[PDB]
């Protein structure tokens, strides 16, 4: 979509609990998260080998936040790698910030 508002707030919200997401696999998320450009995901598949989680995950959120709508696919990213709890975390944010508006 266009104009990230709730999707922008989600970044700032999750940035507060980044430490909870610091226990995730960022590379496993990549094929489960198709809201970015291949280059963006490929970049994460570069930093992954350099750092692992932390730097990769930070750049993950940093690249995600500029894709207005990332949140929805991101739910399916954590949940796609059996990390339903981390999906729940984001889902509970987006449950408040524009959950369903149609």
Helix (H, G, I), strand (E, B) or coil at 17: helix
Token output for 101: 């508006």
Domain ranges of the chain: 1-102
Method by which the coordinates were obtained = NMR
Token output for 64: 């995600």
Q: How many CA atoms are closer than 13 Å to the CA of 10, on its beta-carbon side?
A: 31
Torsion of CA 14, 50, 28, 37, to 10 degrees: 80
Distance CA 76, CA 29 (A): 9
Q: Which of 2, 12, 17 is nearest to 78 (CA)?
A: 17
Token output for 60: 């993950």
* Phi-psi region at 82: left, alpha or beta (left = phi > 0; alpha = psi -120 to 50): left
Token output for 14: 């999750």
What kind of architecture, by CATH, is found in domain 1-102? Orthogonal Bundle (1.10)
Please list, in sequence order, all residues whose beta carbon lies within 8 angstroms of the beta carbon of residue 2, skipping any fewer than 6 positions away: 68
């Amino acid at each position: 979509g266009s104009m990230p508002f709730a999707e922008d707030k989600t970044y700032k919200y999750i940035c507060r609990n980044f430490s909870n997401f610091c226990n995730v696999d960022v590379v496993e998320i990549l094929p489960y998260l198709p809201c970015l450009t291949a280059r963006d995901q490929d970049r994460l598949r570069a930093t992954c080998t350099l750092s692992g989680n932390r730097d990769t995950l930070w750049h993950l959120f940093n690249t995600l936040q500029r894709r207005p709508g990332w949140v929805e696919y991101f739910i399916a990213a954590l949940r796609g790698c059996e990390l339903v709890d981390l999906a729940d975390e984001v889902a509970s944010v987006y449950q408040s910030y524009q959950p369903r508006t149609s």
